[PDB]
Design a protein around this ligand. Sequence first.
Ligand code: MGD
Ligand code: MGD
Ligand code: SF4
Ligand code: SF4
Ligand code: SF4
Ligand code: SF4
Ligand code: H2S
Ligand code: W
Lengths: 214, 973
Amino acid sequence: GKMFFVDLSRCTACRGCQIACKQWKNLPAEETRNTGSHQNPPDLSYVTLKTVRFTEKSRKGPGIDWLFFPEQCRHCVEPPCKGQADVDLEGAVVKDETTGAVLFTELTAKVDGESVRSACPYDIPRIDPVTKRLSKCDMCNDRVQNGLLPACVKTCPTGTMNFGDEQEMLALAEKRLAEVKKTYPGAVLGDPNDVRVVYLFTRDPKDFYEHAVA
Amino acid sequence: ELQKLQWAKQTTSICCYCAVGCGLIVHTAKDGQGRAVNVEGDPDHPINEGSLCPKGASIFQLGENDQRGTQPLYRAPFSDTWKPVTWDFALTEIAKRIKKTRDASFTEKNAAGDLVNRTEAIASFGSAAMDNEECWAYGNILRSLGLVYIEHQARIXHSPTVPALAESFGRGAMTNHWNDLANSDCILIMGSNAAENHPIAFKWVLRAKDKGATLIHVDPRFTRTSARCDVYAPIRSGADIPFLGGLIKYILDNKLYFTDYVREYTNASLIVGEKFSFKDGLFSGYDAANKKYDKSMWAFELDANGVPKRDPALKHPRCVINLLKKHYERYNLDKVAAITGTSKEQLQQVYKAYAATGKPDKAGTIMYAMGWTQHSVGVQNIRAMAMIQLLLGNIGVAGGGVNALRGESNVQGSTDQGLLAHIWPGYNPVPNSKAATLELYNAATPQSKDPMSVNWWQNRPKYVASYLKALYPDEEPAAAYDYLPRIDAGRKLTDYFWLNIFEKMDKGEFKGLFAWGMNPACGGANANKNRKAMGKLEWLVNVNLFENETSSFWKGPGMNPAEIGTEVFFLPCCVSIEKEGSVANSGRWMQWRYRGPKPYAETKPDGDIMLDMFKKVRELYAKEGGAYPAPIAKLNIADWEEHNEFSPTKVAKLMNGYFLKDTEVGGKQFKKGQQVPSFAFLTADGSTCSGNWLHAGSFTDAGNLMARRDKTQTPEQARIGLFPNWSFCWPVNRRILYNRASVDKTGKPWNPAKAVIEWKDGKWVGDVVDGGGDPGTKHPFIMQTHGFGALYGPGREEGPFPEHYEPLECPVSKNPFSKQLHNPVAFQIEGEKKAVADPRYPFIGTTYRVTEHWQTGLMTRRCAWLVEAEPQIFCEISKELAKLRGIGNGDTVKVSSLRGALEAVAIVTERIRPFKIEGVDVHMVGLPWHYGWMVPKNGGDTANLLTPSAGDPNTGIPETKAFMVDVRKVWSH
Ligand SMILES: Nc1nc2c(c(=O)[nH]1)N[C@H]1C(S)=C(S)[C@@H](COP(=O)(O)OP(=O)(O)OC[C@H]3O[C@@H](n4cnc5c(=O)[nH]c(N)nc54)[C@H](O)[C@@H]3O)O[C@H]1N2
Ligand SMILES: Nc1nc2c(c(=O)[nH]1)N[C@H]1C(S)=C(S)[C@@H](COP(=O)(O)OP(=O)(O)OC[C@H]3O[C@@H](n4cnc5c(=O)[nH]c(N)nc54)[C@H](O)[C@@H]3O)O[C@H]1N2
Ligand code: SF4
Ligand code: SF4
Ligand code: SF4
Ligand code: SF4
Ligand SMILES: [S]
Ligand SMILES: [W+6]
């Protein structure tokens, strides 16, 4: 089915992807404050399916390694969120067999949410404490099925975001890895055989975020 | 199909934010009769290819915002509350105020008995946010009312760029365009944070890098731009001339300049007079008492025939190039490093990297903006880089040029339409009092007796005459020229500019102000002065999208509504996607956009507001008469109208211009009514009208060339991304300016792989040639009097060569280059204190932007998604400063200058580090200026509380990029 290749060597942390996701879905805004960082909202939530994490790491000589990470559901080929959810109720987490989208339904309200989240290696699912429904990135499956790019892929100015067939995007990922590896020797693809959102990290993925890789 | 977009009509627009000019697709409900349901990028637009930064991507939420103004509001003198009123009430009462105020302050003759026909007691601010047709129209309306105090964003933005690049190249505009960045071999970003401030531009910057380019960011801070660059060097704020002058020395000293290019295409050969000297920070001709230069001392030595003398061997001691080497020999890495804070190692690496584009088959571009412009030495910052591009043969070539990045979507276009005190549309100077007649006006225009020097400005009489025929087509140009208002020849131009307007306003000398699509209570430097000064107005007409700090200054912080007698009319306009028109991007690309939704509630397009407002003024002058009512009565507003609404189309056609009678021009036959095909076909005799001569070509008999959406290119056009058939750029679709410098004597490209033009079969192919004529037969800089790229630029107020001067508020008390600490002719106001190496304000202040917010934040502080990402004012400080002041990351701090004080949350980061300046650590405090007291709660107020009302002697731009502050921990709550 489909795959994203996310080239973090070209991210400007413009947060176009963050805004594009909310515009397409018409998601409400969280109430945020500055706690000493550009990062906001601080975390994924029921109404934030993608936020850009900002981490400052050191390098030799002038400046810093500024690591940007637009976090989203990885759309796992064999998703543990679905395994866990199916114990309580099937239909709460379904797979689109054409796109590869892992999709949450209203039926997540009737499963143990803390368990679905705890089942996720990348710690992605968020619960509405009011309604008990779970939310995450739905791969803009709606748009994809009508042949369009996800909102966040269409909006990206830089070539960080790429989307299409699994075969194309793995080939692009390996090509871009070899090229980027010259500028950045610690660069790696994130769990490329297990997910449909393959990130190119410019150094140790953990530096980007605790749950960047499984 | 998609549920969201299914019964909605698709239309195209262009982004209402930055000058990149990104393409938008807009979906409007009930196939056009309802509200916008979606806004995203246009996948077919050649610049953004469907990309949007978060400002563009949240336009939907701007358009469909419930905090938007619904209808006109009235604030009575000493009132603490708004009264909803009708458009009929608001616009009739404003006309009465306009008329009353004009009658009481209209000066026919000045002190000296010269004719001026001007209103002294009304000023207008704005706007680069309005369409090109509304900008042109607004300026003609204001001038028909006899206003001279006409300003907008441009004054406090790129005002230095215009005289800087015009002195250097003849034009003041961005020399290439956005797609051309992909052709560069070295992109120097400096005075610019383009990944944040021109995001879609980084698409082309990173494509340059994909194909071998080196990316260099030189900035006081490590930014989102720095992270995606190959080389990052720090530089202290207001220390850019040292850096650039160091690079000039390095280029010359190592013979890395392009010899042939420099010899033939620049003024390197020209001989400078014996009167020109420089001694310890002063050029020849300094009047110490008037704080003014006698530019006569800087003239070229002329041959008998009027032409400046040349030594092609570059041997004569008073050759421009030999005087250049002499000037910048003092800029050695040791002295530049001590004053910039930039290490010798790092200077050497940036210089080596950028200087290598000296080769003919290489192109280095500079991307610069507010980091260079917003200084007392703003203009000289830009000259210095303009000089570097000429030494390296980078002007005219693909992947080269001076990319002065324009800010607002139509600031280029609003400057084009002469919404500044000193210019009419088409950059014709506003006439001064000594210009008693149209002949004396045109007699100022310099002339050349060099056969190769095109000196295209010689055609001015045609443009000035066609413009006056655009306003007043039933009157002789000689007669119409007496209707338009004049400035005093005695006074400095800066007496008519932004900063002095607020000084005058604060002494009670203004009764009326149009804040039209601007927010000067947040955008104007020294906001406290501005907020007090607006209190001294009789009336204020604020036209904007939302209630704001300008509209409601009377209930702002430390304000008692009951003490303030200002009458305020708030008039709500439409957003960009609710109206049709054109906007001029940084590339001069004049792009046409379409109506999506109908105007929200009872909001009105700017054009419709100003036309209706003017119709009430004229109608009132017919009834009861008053001061000199001719220019009002006779102004051609018939051609601005169709179906009893403003017609952007008809105005665009008038701005292009057409024939008033059948005539014969340039060896061709034209029939009355036909559109003027180009500015070459305009006439001084009164047979052609044209609102703006740069627009001559934009709307022909062929049709609206601004609305062309054709990606078709020749193979040589496609190789450098020219997209000649996508919209239209001025002048006459020349996508890369000065492209005649991109070929040798015979017309062969310097860089054949990336050719702009080329002589092939008795024609230029590629880009429209900038200056007609066979190879070798003309000088390639056609807008220059002498036709050459100016290394020596004798028209500039502080001298013909950039020299280092410390900012008006600086951390040092001694300039290591001279005895002249400050710019010797700096624009200052009497008795405004400056903090210079003062222990009470020991820290460098600067102000700058983030990706998520636009300008003062009037617009984006209303967009919940942009507030979500950047909720409050922050203060960026180093780890070392935070240690010294006991400030932790996330702590509240107080930033203070001599002018004001504000609270912000501290961001402690290695992205800022001390500057080692003369063996002493100097700390910098950085603030965004996107915040104001009205929205959101806990957001904070403008950094412009801190910024000084002093700046560039040429243009009156304030020094918002380098001043002095303290920062202190706040212990409250
Ligand atoms: N996101 C966003 N984009 C915008 C705007 C906005 O408000 N937000 N506004 C638009 C407008 S109107 C304009 S004109 C442009 C402005 O575009 P920019 O020039 O990018 O704007 P700034 O971020 O104000 O300043 C640029 C950089 O100059 C650095 N700097 C400060 N002082 C100095 C100095 O003395 N020397 C040097 N070399 N650098 C210095 C600052 O640290 C900052 O990183 O952006 C346009 N686009
Ligand atoms: N300290 C500091 N001060 C600065 C700067 C800086 O870098 N530092 N930058 C300077 C620069 S480059 C600029 S350009 C100025 C900006 O100063 P201002 O122009 O006062 O800024 P805003 O008003 O925030 O932004 C433009 C306005 O256009 C309005 N607008 C949008 N669409 C329309 C429309 O269709 N019609 C009308 N009538 N209005 C519309 C918006 O509502 C908004 O109020 O600030 C300058 N001031
Ligand atoms: S839109 Fe692209 S460049 Fe911008 S933050 Fe998101 S991934 Fe990075
Ligand atoms: S990333 Fe987490 S929530 Fe997303 S598919 Fe994989 S296990 Fe499920
Ligand atoms: S794919 Fe769609 S839902 Fe997922 S992050 Fe992108 S825009 Fe949001
Ligand atoms: S703000 Fe500028 S870069 Fe962003 S979408 Fe608008 S025009 Fe493009
Ligand atoms: S601007
Ligand atoms: W600007």
